[PDB]
Amino acid sequence: GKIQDSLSSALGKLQNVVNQNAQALNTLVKQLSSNFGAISSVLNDILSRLDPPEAEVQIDRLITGRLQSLQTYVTQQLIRAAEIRASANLAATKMSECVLGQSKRVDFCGKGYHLMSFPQSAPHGVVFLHVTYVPAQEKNFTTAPAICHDGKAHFPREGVFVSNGTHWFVTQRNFYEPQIITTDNTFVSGNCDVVIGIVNNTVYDPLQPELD
Amino acid sequence: SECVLGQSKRVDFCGKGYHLMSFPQSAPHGVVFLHVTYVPAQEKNFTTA
Amino acid sequence: DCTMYICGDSTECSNLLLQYGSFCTQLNRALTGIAVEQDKNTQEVFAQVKQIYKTPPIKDFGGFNFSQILPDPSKPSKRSPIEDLLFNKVKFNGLTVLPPLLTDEMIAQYTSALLAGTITSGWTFGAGPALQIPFPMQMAYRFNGIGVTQNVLYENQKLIANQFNSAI
Amino acid sequence: CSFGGVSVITPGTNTSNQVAVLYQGVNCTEVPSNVFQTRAGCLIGAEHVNNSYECDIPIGAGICASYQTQSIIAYTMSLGAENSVAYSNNSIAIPTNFTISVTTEILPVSMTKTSV
């Protein structure tokens, strides 16, 4: 609902390519009224006040100037089209990678974590609406890399060990959701004297009580 | 964006090896990227199935 | 300045050149567009950060040593050990050179903030609000991203930090 | 002998009709109130303040201008806020909520086909 307000109330990149092309086409026509060193700018005025041997010299001065101006127009259009081409090549890649997929590239389909994208057509281009996830409202906790228990070192399978001040849990790294540390969400490797930062805490076995 | 503000899985976009992280430095009219990568070493052969 | 390069002072030249139309207005527009694009190039590469982040006064980074690439407080430019090495290795007839909008003090200040964001928050400052994490734990997250199990980092921390330091 | 472009800085005629003038890379003692010397030339008609804001109208070499509220001014642009991460060897921050955000991106694909 806010995209609609912010637009209804920004398309400068599309306006600039229209303006540049019109400014060049006008400069092309406004050159049809320069002498380039001749008696006038009209061929019906050199063909009316000069005999054919003298009007050749004056017509050539116009021909040279007008050819120069047309060829300048055609060079600058090649250079402007090579730039529009790269923009369209980027738009074609964003349509593939943000609209028909989910991208992992950072800051390619918005700012945040890309969820999805929607295309909309514009006069000579395309608008992408990028939907991203942004995390909010953070707290600090204290962490450890591993937990020592029974002389073994335990590491989280897919999370982080955190402490609310007195107790130790596992969360997932992007959203706070604490769990009891068990042998189902941790794994073991080694003894607890080579890691630096290990803390002492109990790792709960689910079978051990339940069975008994 | 992709080598300094994140970790890349694109092959050879941030150096040779498995991209760990990258650091930027400013140069005159340019930029220098120091790419830190992980390179495996000292392999042994085994039988497999 | 098209007129001052061509004619140049003389006045018999200016009235004759006035006969060519807008050839000189086009050239000045072309050169001005180029000069405006050079500042946008630099804004797009370097001003990729919301805040100007600072490193804490300690340097307890798990045995990793970033001193050759952090800024040097004893300098007017505040560049770092590797940025000082890089900067020591690289009026007329209407011609003029404009200065860039950003000083390179400003550019060095953008780069040091990008560096302190990475060393202190990993990749969280690039997609929301920076969230601190200990370096040795961020390095272990990154070992997971290349498919190595994360005790391989914690059991080899000193060796890995020495190899980083020698490569730097 | 000195020579250089002249630029006019305006807040827009829909805001005011005051104006400031930049004489590009000219020493400000040979121009012909507020005369202010810049690495980019001599600026006339804007006052130099000591604050630092986000850049509005770019002058150059780190200097921008703006018509706050009530006259043009000069200064050094602002890179951005200042965030201080409370980094420690055993502290972590974890988010408890999220926002869904949606932004736009505009791209040109074509231009007009002309023939002569």
Ligand SMILES: *[C@@H]1O[C@H](CO)[C@@H](O[C@@H]2O[C@H](CO)[C@@H](O)[C@H](O)[C@H]2NC(C)=O)[C@H](O)[C@H]1NC(C)=O
């Ligand atoms: C995380 O804890 C740190 C440590 O206190 C907090 O950072 C300090 O916050 C106070 C008040 O905002 C400032 O005066 C200090 O300068 C901060 N830094 C220190 C003490 O190094 C921070 O606010 C906490 N973060 C959250 C999300 O609660």
Ligand SMILES: *[C@@H]1O[C@H](CO)[C@@H](O[C@@H]2O[C@H](CO)[C@@H](O)[C@H](O)[C@H]2NC(C)=O)[C@H](O)[C@H]1NC(C)=O
């Ligand atoms: C850390 O979280 C634990 C939750 O497991 C808190 O301990 C429990 O708190 C509730 C309500 O205060 C009590 O009913 C329980 O008896 C407590 N113990 C257990 C094992 O559940 C603990 O207070 C929290 N600590 C801090 C500093 O917030």
Ligand SMILES: *[C@@H]1O[C@H](CO)[C@@H](O[C@@H]2O[C@H](CO)[C@@H](O)[C@H](O)[C@H]2NC(C)=O)[C@H](O)[C@H]1NC(C)=O
């Ligand atoms: C974590 O637990 C282990 C084992 O319970 C502790 O190791 C004991 O530490 C005491 C005090 O230093 C010694 O007297 C014992 O000989 C140790 N026993 C063993 C088997 O090592 C260890 O100190 C605890 N860590 C902390 C920080 O309290």
Ligand SMILES: *[C@@H]1O[C@H](CO)[C@@H](O[C@@H]2O[C@H](CO)[C@@H](O)[C@H](O)[C@H]2NC(C)=O)[C@H](O)[C@H]1NC(C)=O
């Ligand atoms: C793994 O075994 C293979 C052989 O099966 C080794 O390749 C042999 O390597 C030696 C020494 O370089 C060569 O002289 C032989 O010609 C190779 N064998 C063949 C069939 O070409 C390989 O080097 C071994 N790698 C490791 C790590 O042990």
Ligand SMILES: *[C@@H]1O[C@H](CO)[C@@H](O[C@@H]2O[C@H](CO)[C@@H](O)[C@H](O)[C@H]2NC(C)=O)[C@H](O)[C@H]1NC(C)=O
């Ligand atoms: C980070 O590395 C630098 C080396 O680039 C260390 O600085 C050098 O330390 C050695 C002895 O360890 C001295 O002989 C050199 O004179 C130092 N060079 C300087 C100060 O420019 C630096 O000590 C390391 N950081 C830490 C915390 O150990």
Ligand SMILES: *[C@@H]1O[C@H](CO)[C@@H](O[C@@H]2O[C@H](CO)[C@@H](O)[C@H](O)[C@H]2NC(C)=O)[C@H](O)[C@H]1NC(C)=O
């Ligand atoms: C997470 O954030 C949302 C806001 O984005 C919170 O929901 C808002 O709650 C306030 C107060 O209850 C209401 O006035 C708003 O109407 C709610 N927003 C929406 C969009 O419904 C939500 O409570 C937060 N959750 C937690 C656990 O803090």
Ligand SMILES: *[C@@H]1O[C@H](CO)[C@@H](O)[C@H](O)[C@H]1NC(C)=O
């Ligand atoms: C963290 O630093 C403190 C100093 O305040 C030190 O006592 C402790 O041993 C360090 N722990 C780790 C895991 O680096």
Ligand SMILES: *[C@@H]1O[C@H](CO)[C@@H](O)[C@H](O)[C@H]1NC(C)=O
């Ligand atoms: C331009 O003028 C209109 C009406 O005079 C006004 O609504 C609008 O706010 C003005 N724009 C600016 C940027 O002041």
Ligand SMILES: *[C@@H]1O[C@H](CO)[C@@H](O)[C@H](O)[C@H]1NC(C)=O
């Ligand atoms: C302008 O000339 C004066 C007089 O020599 C000099 O003091 C001043 O430094 C000059 N301007 C600049 C920017 O150097």
Ligand SMILES: *[C@@H]1O[C@H](CO)[C@@H](O)[C@H](O)[C@H]1NC(C)=O
């Ligand atoms: C700006 O601050 C400096 C501090 O060195 C001071 O000397 C100067 O007078 C200040 N400028 C104004 C306009 O107050």
